[PDB]
């Protein structure tokens, strides 16, 4: 599916296990809260591929319309109910443009039935597709009400919806007020920012490739440490990974200081950290080779 | 030369020790210090270096990030491809070359975009925009083919770029696949993309902030000083500048020759492959290389003329570049006290180009030309900046310019007393301390206690107790004009500062007048004097406004500049297209009219455009991407509204339309508005009537300013009322006079005019009975003149030994002469108000000026 | 006057091209003309003298249409390499290459306002472009097949199109779309042209119509027949005022006279036809070329008609 | 809901008839449409001044004869319920 | 552009008829082959056995 | 359209080559030019742009001369492998190869009627072929040495060929023989119909030919006498040709100079430093203002005419 090399640590393994257990749960919807670039949609894609679920994304663009969202919802509901396909519906909060998106998402998460989505010719097409699906499954159903009930049961069994949004107190209050199914019919998982242990593990995993061991390295008595449970005394690799972690943390502190002063602020992310360690590896290799 | 080769090659262990730390520092800088400015970049680097030092990780302290991460040939290629010589610009180019995530470029100037265009010019760049409808076709063409892509206007970001930025790539077989939308596109390896925005004040969502890396092209003080030095070299010594430019190019080419020669020598000595003495070709090549090393040795004459050029340009034009950098950074930090006016580097450079070249009375003497340039730079900067700023903040900007002039010029730095003047008012006082309240009061006693912290004011309580006869500075009159007492010879500027501190401690209501006196003593008496006259709109539009910059005309509520622009177009005989923004057909008509006016060269005016900010952003983008006629001006009429986009505010030229300050300025504005042909018509009493109208209008408008004593509620007495009044006066004078050159003061319909003003013209807005009675008694006082009695009194200025007499003139020329020679001082008793009306207002304005200056200084 | 008609033989037979000539147009202000062919070149010819002036390389595939603006200082060309180029005719260099279409672009024109360009391509879409920036601002849909030609009206408020969809579709530019859909052609629609202002009186008195009594007589289209006919239409939903049967093969280009008293037409029958449309008959027949005639143009003031053909030759006809 | 085009239709009807117009509660016409209608009001008053000295004014992209007897009146209650503010022009 | 070796041609699939007939079109500078209602670009370096 | 004289510098230097260039000509219709060579290659260039279009391989030895059909759709080339190869400008492929010459062929030209091909080789014979099937029709004899160039008339009935036998024979399908030479005559230029009035003012059909005798001389086929002798060349003359307007004379030689002559006064006005080595051939566009010279230093250069 994706040629993106991921890095493993305890938080990644635990998050993958939680996402897998909720996918195994029937009518199981996620709500992943965490900073952007922390790897929520890629973990969801990987777990859906492991479980055989087909990842479906809105693929929003400019000049998007509530009618276009209705069409995407119709396609995913048809695939999940008539064709009997397990779909992992990944939906970031950036895909929400107005309340027309989120009211329909609320109804879909809470019931599995969205009245008014299929009307007229679309309703007739859905009914004949459900009749074909009932013929394929062997169940014989007469008239439309039990066909729609069977379709609702099928989409309840099949569809899984995963949300991905950044943490915010006011945003969470707004979402809890305007969309209760995110807080009642969705399992919440506060991924958050990468912890100090996760940053240390990622830095050590990338650093282990390149050789920088210094036998004649003197450990100072002070050793300002930012990651707890650091091995004392630390080696050169441990010292520089602690230094990388401190670099990320002091970027957080400087950004907070700038925001408190009143200047514009920018998000600092695990993507920034991976970028920094990749730059470190490439620059170290190039400089050592050329010298 | 092996005596140098051995030293070069005997640092292997030291470089192995330092390489890990130095690579860590450089990688952290490249990855994290992209969005920040120079100060935060340096702060982050210092913090990282301090952490490495206290963790005992070896790194090279005496290194430069630009020199470590960039080669000399690479840097020369960069400045060949249109890049500024800034260290910050070089760092930005390093990020743009070694990016891992695709870059986002922030630059209002466009120099970064031009540099990218020149650098990736060997490859083919298409320059599209995120708001181009056919953007996906260009993106997929670049993806399939392998072309660099530069897309501007990131604010309308297209989330179809998300898999491209995230590198969500499939590697089925030997091909490389990325899936955008429904189509599957083969991804070529030689594809890069650059996102570009043209404003620093923009908010990006956190997902985009994660998936892109930022490169901020901010302006540095050193870069601005270099630019101003080069420009003054252009404007003063063109031959010297030409010599310097050819010199820099020649030196760069010869340094490239040095690098090539050293590389060739080392590669030949490494690839000799046998015995060097076996073949004479190696010896001959080394002889040629040594002859070129000899010309490298004789480079010393070029280095000598380098030093002579640097020393003469420094010793002449050192303190002008620093002054210009201070001016620009003052007007850049000015944006955070009113958030209406935003000024661009292009705006400051236009001011500097105006003062450098088109200066009247500027000679052929380099001794005096620098002083003339500096003084006119200060004055022109004040004029062009404060024409689009509030009369509250005029004095603040003037005093900041005075501080810049004082720092530039002799006079020592009065930092201690300036810090006490700005911040020292909030210092903690002694517990349970109270001086004598025999002549002073408690608040000014506490102020004197605070002021006594200065060494010069060691004895203040004893001095004011001994000087009991100095009741003039204690109360009444104008203490600023005559400030007794004192803080070694005393410079006039230091005396002004000490007296300003005394006034701030004793009587804060004279702070504005004393700040005006300080500005007058520091820069000239006639510094602020150009802001009393009506704005020279015809000259400014004709000369000081480029066609592609819209003429933003912001007005406080109650005032509108549409009549001013229409009158300007009528008097210059230029046809105009007035469109009132606020409809879909209005937007379509605005687009069509602006296109036709750009192609042809007419004038276009769009009114009330503060109601459509989303369309204002698109208009700003179109005006930036547009190339207009030579004589074309776009007028945008707005209101003081925080919904006006910062993009349009920076792109345009702001003219704040404000209530005219003072009766004299109000009369001058009224007389300039009323045409001379209209006011000079028969009979001869029309001039008297128009002067009475102008005086009445000025008095009631200034009374409106002094609320709620002047009027119970803030009415809007304006130019519509004045024009209707003039029309009624003209009609009644024509009715009562049929071709008569002179009309006796008894036959004129004074009562008819008075009751028509009382009922219809000015009394329409008035609803309160007491306000109506006040208007009626002003009309009765003014519109009888005791039958045009000589030495008639319009009002009384001061109740003690002062009065205002109406002139005995007959012609508009001598009336406006009397108005011009009216005294510059004003008192609320001119209007008929109590003398204590303005005290609280002046105190509040003074403390607000102090707060604004303190905020700008603290955030500086 | 308002009566000159091309007469045999031709004035000059300019034969500098290498592939079939696609479109030939005149210059608005100069005594020069340009011609587009299938060898990715746009030759510029002085029709008064008869000598080749210069060429405009830059297109990768066969250039299919060219159009000047009102000032005569811009030339917009579209080709089969899915790109549209804007030529600075003062210095004869390309200003911008404007991608965005998905197939062979078939025709372009510059609106009378002068800062917008229309298009038409095989992906059944018509796009509006910006001359100043090069961006696409509006796309038109509705045609079910390859759109062959697009022509804005006299004041730029209406756009007509012809397609392999068998239909002529005309719409207002600004906000609404599909003002009319004209469906009386039994084969492909190929070449449209509006009616000039000094033709409305003759059209009204020639066709079945009352003595106006409605005001604003309404615009009139022309032909577009691969079924060897000529058809002019009306305002609103559109009716065929007359059909000029009498043609021989696939009609490729139609025009009005400068005075509006005649219809000029050329086609694959190697024939230039002059139609006296007041009597619904062709009163003059010109054996133009030795192969299919692809395009023609008529000079607004000077008496010259120029025709391009698959013969790889561009012929200029003097009018007597 | 009195749009710019609706007010233009009312204006052309009033101009052709020669009748006064009393617009009650004008300050709830909202800012955008008030500013748009200002242009039509200015055009009508300019045509009336030209009459004062076959007189037409450009209303809704058409030429409409202006009878000399018409006038436009505005009834307002400022500060009623935080309604709209008229533009200065 | 991957070569194919499609065995078991006794149960031949008639979807390959345009491919075997080389019924291609050359809109633009590329080549277009039609499979059913779907339209797909054909790479030059493709053979099928 | 008469003042067209080449001016410095070279507009375009078509150096995309590897072997010496022998002959260069212009296309009568299209805006391209072709060039023969020593490495059995004929390359087509675009003289307006300067870009290399295509090469026409298929010869097995050095190409001597090349000539075009009147319509410009047919190209005939002769080489040193005793062949007269025929090319078309529709698909750019060899149509037919004609054998029958006993040694190196040095000249070829399409008849103005576009049906027969003339050739001239070292075996001192002139051969006429059929463009339809490549079958020879007639052979001409009367030379005893190397025949360098042969050039037809404007009607297809008069044929002039120059040889190393110090003669320029003229045959009618021998009208005259001119034996007042002093060295080997190398190139032949025919006088167009746009020069009869000019030469009547200064002094048909007329014949002008350079030679290795450092001079150019010109006769009348109706009388067989030299009209005017043009002298001043510093080396062997390789190529001569009339101006399109029939007023000037263009020629090239081994002195690396283009001298533009005239029969009004018989003197040189401007010599052009063309190449760093000898100049083998040149051509003048009949309507366009361009001069191209093919030189033996493996370069082809095009001169603007102002
Ligand atoms: N555990 C990980 N190890 C390495 N890289 C990761 C990891 N998690 C995320 N990433 C990076 O994040 C990118 C995708 O981020 P994404 O999942 O879109 O963030 P979000 O889920 O917050 O939108 C990938 O390109 C990948 O390089």
Numbering used by the authors:
A (entry chain A): 2904 to 3194
B (entry chain A): 3485 to 3846, 3849 to 3895, 3897 to 3974, 3978 to 4350
C (entry chain E): 91 to 410
D (entry chain A): 1935 to 1987, 1996 to 2031
E (entry chain B): 3630 to 3678
F (entry chain C): 91 to 263, 268 to 297, 308 to 410
Text from the published report:
Cytoplasmic dynein-1 is a conserved, minus-end-directed microtubule motor critical for cell division and long-range intracellular transport in eukaryotic cells. Dynein, a member of the AAA + (ATPase associated with various cellular activities) family, forms a 1.4 MDa dimer composed of two copies each of heavy (HC), intermediate (IC), light intermediate (LIC), and three (TCTEX, LC8, and ROBL) light chains (LC), with the IC, LIC, and LC known as accessory chains. Cellular and structural studies have shown that dynein primarily exists in a pseudo-twofold symmetric, autoinhibited Phi state incompatible with movement along microtubules. LIS1 plays essential roles in the activation of dynein, including relieving autoinhibition and helping assemble the fully active DDA transport complexes.
We identified three major species: individual dynein motors (Open), Phi, and a third state similar to Phi but with two LIS1 β-propellers bound to dynein, which we termed Pre-Chi. We next turned to the Pre-Chi species. Its 2D classes showed Phi-like features and had only one set of LIS1 β-propellers bound instead of the two seen in Chi. We obtained a 3.1 Å structure of the Pre-Chi motor domains. The LIS1-induced opening of one side in Pre-Chi disrupts three of the four interfaces involved in Phi stabilization (Linker:Linker, Linker:AAA4, AAA5:AAA5). The Linker:Linker interface is only disrupted on the side where LIS1 is bound. In addition to the interactions that, based on our models, are common to both Pre-Chi and Chi, we identified two Pre-Chi-specific interfaces (red circles #3-4). The first interface involves a trans interaction between the β-propeller of LIS1 bound to sitering in one motor domain (HC-1) and the linker domain of the other motor domain (HC-2) (red circle #3-4 and Supplementary Movie 5). This interaction is mediated by a loop on LIS1 (residues 298–308) that has not been modeled in any structure of human dynein-LIS1 to date. The second Pre-Chi interface involves another interaction in trans between LIS1 bound to sitering in HC-1 and AAA5 of HC-2 (red circle #4).
